[PDB]
Subunit: 335 residues, 4 copies
């Protein structure tokens, strides 16, 4: 039958990965783990502020919940090493808690009996960081623990690859205007990780913040390692984000048209192209990992010296989740 | 010299109580306790999203911080029983963590050496619940643990008293349209206390939620115990709230004017009166505990049967804080 | 073939009425009028911040736009008396500009050649005010200008009817906690109609405001004329709203359960029932005119005197639009 | 006595300039013009969602309003050529309506009798564009119509000057993450100027949009004419903005520290310097034209090739307004 998936952390990425799996044959979520009870899990699956009402039926049953007639087993175990993955025969854990973002920590799922772990974030340790349709083919099926990178990395990789392949990337700087996330406080309050900015009221501020997306791009595209860096501004939309990239290229006399054309030629189910004057809410729930926006391309030329600026939208939620689940499927399929 | 105050929980209420104590002679905050470091505390005192920049100078120093030339000792101790209150000679603890909202739990501060505790919230146990300028005179100086009630209770009490004194309260229902607070999640997520509504994205929803304010009004005004109940709708403003009360009265043929008049006559530093067409942002940072809005008075008469509706604004932060600090001062002065 | 509909004012209600007519056979929108060009119209139809991407294809063509292979003629004419309705054989104008909310003013469409007008708001003059599934049967086919009421009226009517039929309505008061609309300013600015509250930053305040919904309920349910009144708080969500109604009933010893069952028994495609602890975003895009929320029903009893409170959600946009289009269909079919 | 000022367009910039003039001696606002009545004007002066309650007393009087005992005459006249500026002896009109942003159009105030006009925006035609403390010394007193530039320009100019003087500006690109403003729609609607992005729900989207600030910088700093370009993202905060500038410099091996120090050395009352990890609400109401944020400086070095990124905050309202008022004072003082 299907690939057996357990989701660890039924949060934003967890539940959306659950929804998305509902429309990909060969994958079944058989178990979910988190820190709450079934009443709350079922409820947050059914209702979603940004992504909309869940389409199927959800019902609390014994030991978990039923979704469109399928039993999902649920657990409330903060220590992953104690999860009953061996008895459940879990083929892949989707690790979406935010607390196991390291090869050695995530290993706990393997000890508990899962065959492989896919982490919904950048992760430290000796493992591959994968953006689907940019470098998934670097997976060979011997990996046990894999990172699915970040929303920002997924928005940036296909854009950066085209810039480098077609024009030769000398260097660039990124800013991501990014929806606020669960890691920010509702009101000004002490922040768990001592970040004085993620401390502030999330929905009432433009908030500068760091991201590894550009700095660690070299893990996704080794041939440009060290050539990008940048940061983020977290702003008050609840999901939907934009990556602006300003670069220096080797090729001279570059034009808006050549850049846009090159992006369009690279488009697929991960990397979308648009020429419509859209805004963030238009990309909520979209399944492209990156939507290239040709209306935002600019070229500064002073004499023979040029800066090239481009921008790609991503739903930091659904865009990333759709990539995560593509990498999931590919990863499972290799065994 | 001054009354020695320690603040437990340097959060929204804690920091604002600190600010407000800066302009009230005879009160000095000598200690603060929370779960973070000085860098974070100093920072959140200096900067405040809704309430504005702190006016004085704040500098991180050894074992705490200096504010306008005064040393504040700071601690990072979750178990209150362990705080050095005896060494510091604490006269009153302002208990503003949200975790000691009960007479027996709050007792921990007394064991630790504080003479008295004032809790920035409704609290269970055998103790007095005080709304300044409605029933603060019920304090005699033999109390060790006192509750300052809630924001909503302070908004409501003075309105409820006038209605009862002047018209005879038969019964009523309340809804507070309330700013969202720190116990709501930033994004849809499991809620610590299992509340499926406080679980939702705070700044993106109208959220029905409970409040004891009306049900427990009888602790502040015994003679109307059991006559009020109601709830809240948490909405996306970061601070600033409104209490609507709909009531049945014993007196007949009541008019809008008679109600407004009676409210105006009862106005003081705690209970304000306005006839201007204001909106929530207008009351941010105000120091009335309750601002009666005459433009919102409504009287429904069918034959000889009437419903009377009124509304009072409050800054759930600063209004409550100003009331809290008035009570603190009165409380400390009684010994 | 189909009934020929022209939409006047391609705004929030106009474009959603357009979307909604795409899925109701026997109605075709053949013309649209507004104050802009086709580029803008096509665009606002394609992309909708709260209601999501339009599903079909939209293309600017000559003299209007093409939707799913169908030609829509578009005009840019502020004076309705000059629209080419006679030439286009318009059966019904859906009047959604906010500028023709009066029988005599709306008469301009009839002079221009439309057979009938349906107004997407309360309207003054000698005409029927219709809430589908509460009093649409009051239409006999001799009306030329009809009002579809307001979102609030549509949320309230079916609730008020069950209350009266099953308990005897004595009197009541309403508050609707309501998403902000286009008649509010983005920033504090002079307000076109002199309302000092609708003048304020819409997305940054809780804003009291008037509404005729309750006061004029007797146009929809004559037997309770004069027994309801109340107002609105406009709050920062971009669509989705809640009506709170506090009532006195002739029936004594009423329980929460009795009220809830009576509501459930009246449910249909206009009046939904829920027991889930939902929040405003959960109703965005729903097609019930009114969603009764059983979780919010309260009964305050003091001796034999009771106040009953209930609450019904409505997407002020899509709920109202769904009702408007049901009324449109029924209206057109009577001829 | 004082310089006589009239404010045309008592909008955000108009009212804030009015407040700010209350604390600059030698300036008196004697008259205000807009399109509303006195009730509305007085009210919007008193109450301000982001900027707070006005401190003095405001009272509607005959033919205007009284502020702190001073009579302000008010008018309701859309055609500036008809304003009674000669009878009032206006020395300067502050042109803040957004409808006279051109030398020839603004001439109308001169014909009506004003001696000089200062425009609260970029303006076309033969006139000087002034950022106070960057180029106000280019004013000689023979100017009759002057532009105060934009908030963005005022944020950018001092930053760009330091970059050019100390390192040699080769070229650069700018993005401003900007609070939404009054020219955006509350809900998705046709936009007055045909802009399909400014058409969208302002407080629910990240919205790319154009700005002349970088492109026209050469009007403020001639020696870098043509070297900058860029755009804006309008995001959901009601006021408070950030300018990010990414540049190529002549000087090689530039460091973060060198850049920051050079910015600190240039600081004055128009150009602030900070090393605190602040967020947008922290700059609401600040009087710096530009607040340089040292924590956001980055230097990307690949071999011998560098990009330098910096960022400066501004309250697009109060920062701009304080700059406008300083230019007003200097302008009037030259005659
Ligand atoms: N845009 C995004 O939200 C986004 C995009 C890509 C990746 N990510 C990453 O994915 C991860 C999750 O992000 P999120 O936004 O979904 O966070 P979230 O807070 O919504 O989800 C975390 C969930 O996991 C649960 N959890 C926490 N500790 C646990 C434990 N020890 N055992 C079991 N369950 C536990 C929490 O209760 C919560 O339900 C993070 O690493 C985040 O950085 C987020
Ligand atoms: N926010 C309001 O509108 C408001 C109004 C009236 C009353 N209150 C009440 O005041 C209390 C706190 O309110 P708040 O909004 O400031 O909460 P908050 O979210 O700001 O948190 C308060 C602080 O308590 C600290 N804390 C938590 N546990 C602690 C511990 N064990 N020891 C020491 N410090 C600890 C937290 O780190 C935080 O800084 C609550 O009881 C609340 O209901 C709040
Ligand atoms: N939006 C809601 O929540 C809601 C709910 C129920 C009823 N309504 C009512 O429907 C009507 C429209 O509401 P909306 O919120 O969709 O407004 P809106 O501002 O989005 O739409 C009005 C549209 O009509 C256009 N218009 C204005 N004058 C015109 C004219 N003279 N000729 C042609 N076009 C013109 C405007 O350009 C705009 O597109 C109002 O009466 C409103 O009260 C609104
Ligand atoms: N909002 C900002 O951050 C900001 C910053 C710098 C400059 N500006 C510029 O300042 C100008 C005004 O901006 P705003 O945001 O205060 O706009 P606003 O809409 O808030 O105020 C404009 C005012 O002009 C009045 N008005 C319009 N036409 C008029 C007429 N011809 N005669 C008399 N009064 C008229 C309106 O009633 C309104 O009060 C614009 O040119 C704008 O670009 C805005
Ligand atoms: Cl995150």
């Amino acid at each position: 039958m299907a690939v057996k998936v357990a989701i660890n952390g039924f949060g934003r990425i967890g539940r959306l990965a659950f929804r998305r799996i509902q429309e990909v044959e060969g994958l079944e979520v058989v178990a979910v783990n988190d820190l709450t009870d079934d009443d709350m899990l079922a409820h947050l699956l059914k209702y979603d502020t940004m992504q909309g009402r869940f389409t199927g039926e959800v019902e609390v049953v014994d030991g978990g919940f039923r979704v469109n007639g399928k039993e999902v087993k649920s657990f409330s175990e903060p220590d992953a090493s104690k999860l009953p993955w061996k008895d459940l025969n879990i083929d892949v854990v989707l690790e979406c808690t935010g607390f196991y973002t390291d090869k050695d920590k995530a290993q706990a799922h393997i000890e508990a009996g899962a065959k492989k772990v896919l982490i919904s974030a950048p992760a430290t340790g000796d493992l591959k960081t994968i953006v689907f349709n940019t470098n998934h083919q670097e997976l060979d099926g011997s990996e046990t623990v894999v990172s699915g990178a970040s929303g920002t990395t997924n928005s940036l990789a296909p854009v950066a690859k085209v810039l480098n392949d077609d024009f030769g990337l000398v260097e660039g700087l990124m800013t991501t205007i990014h929806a606020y996330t669960g890691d920010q406080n509702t009101q000004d309050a002490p922040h768990r990780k001592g970040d004085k900015r993620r401390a502030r009221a999330a929905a009432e501020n433009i908030i500068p913040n760091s991201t590894g997306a550009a700095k660690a791009i070299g893990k996704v595209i080794p041939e440009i390692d060290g050539k990008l860096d940048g940061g983020a501004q977290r702003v008050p939309v609840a999901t939907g984000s934009l990556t602006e990239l300003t670069v220096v290229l080797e090729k001279q006399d570059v034009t808006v048209e050549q850049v846009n054309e090159a992006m369009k030629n690279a488009s697929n189910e991960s990397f979308g192209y648009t020429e419509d004057e859209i805004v963030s809410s238009d990309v909520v729930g979209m399944t492209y990992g990156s939507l290239f926006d040709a209306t935002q391309t600019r070229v500064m030329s002073v004499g023979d010296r040029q800066l090239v600026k481009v921008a790609a939208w991503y739903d930091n939620e659904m865009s990333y989740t759709a990539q995560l689940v593509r990498t999931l499927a590919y990863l499972a399929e290799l065994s």
